[PDB]
């Protein structure tokens, strides 16, 4: 049962990661339209598509894809929140310019 669940969740995770990459690309394009060339690879998250192909005797853990000090909540989410704060500051600056 858990193997079927893990296969389904892995497929859902791959779809979600592809959606996240598409949204990151769209955001990068939108920032670049105003001259802010955001590094696409900085915000993208890389996950191996063959991770589940390992035999279940071998362990798969969050620390393998996101060791301490590098998780999404740890670095990526904080980095994108900082980007949002910077864009808000740019909004304030352009509002003062307007």
């Amino acid at each position: 049962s858990r193997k079927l669940e893990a296969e389904g969740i892995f497929k859902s995770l791959l779809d979600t990661l592809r959606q996240y990459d598409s949204s990151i690309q769209n955001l990068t394009r939108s920032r670049s339209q105003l001259g802010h060339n955001v590094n696409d690879s900085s915000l993208k998250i890389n996950i191996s598509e063959n991770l589940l192909d390992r035999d279940f005797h071998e362990g798969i853990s969050y620390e393998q894809l996101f060791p301490k000090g590098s998780g999404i909540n740890e670095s990526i989410k904080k980095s994108i929140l900082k980007l949002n704060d910077e864009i808000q500051e740019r909004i304030k600056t352009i509002e003062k310019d307007n």
């Binding site: 858990r2 969740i9 892995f10 996240y20 279940f56 005797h57 362990g59 909540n73």
Partner: protein, 50 residues
Amino acid sequence: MEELSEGIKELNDLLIQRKKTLDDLTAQQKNLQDTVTTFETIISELYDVL
């Protein structure tokens, strides 16, 4: 009286083999649970960031 001891030995051997199988199954189940929770938390973080 002898079939009794033979059956006891057979039960012990089958128990040992099934215990090895159970240990392997426990390792597989723990790995599956870790993988599932890892994927779930990554999905939740990805949706929050989205």
